[PDB]
Amino acid sequence: DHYNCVSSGGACLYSACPIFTKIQGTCYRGKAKCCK
């Protein structure tokens, strides 16, 4: 979720993960990706 995403160094994003991150879970009731 958003909390554990960001506390782990990830970002909750709605489109493709930006360079140097990749999908590791979701945020925002499953509608965004946790890019980490």
From Swiss-Prot:
Main location: secreted
Subcellular location: Secreted; Membrane
A GO term, aspect molecular function: identical protein binding
Disulfide topology: 5-34, 12-27, 17-35
The keyword Secreted belongs to this UniProt entry's keyword annotation: yes
GO biological process: antibacterial humoral response; antimicrobial humoral immune response mediated by antimicrobial peptide; calcium-mediated signaling; chemotaxis; defense response to bacterium; defense response to Gram-negative bacterium; defense response to Gram-positive bacterium; G protein-coupled receptor signaling pathway
GO cellular component, one term: sperm midpiece
Keywords: Antibiotic, Antimicrobial, Defensin, Disulfide bond, Membrane, Secreted, Signal
Tissues where the protein occurs: Blood plasma. Sperm. Highly expressed in the lower head and midpiece of sperm. Significantly reduced levels found in the sperms of asthenozoospermia and leukocytospermia patients (at protein level).
Protein function: Has bactericidal activity. May act as a ligand for C-C chemokine receptor CCR6. Positively regulates the sperm motility and bactericidal activity in a CCR6-dependent manner. Binds to CCR6 and triggers Ca2+ mobilization in the sperm which is important for its motility.
Similarity comment: Belongs to the beta-defensin family.
Assembly: Monomer. Homodimer.
Record-given protein name: Beta-defensin 1
Protein's gene: DEFB1
Range within the parent protein: 33 to 68 of 68
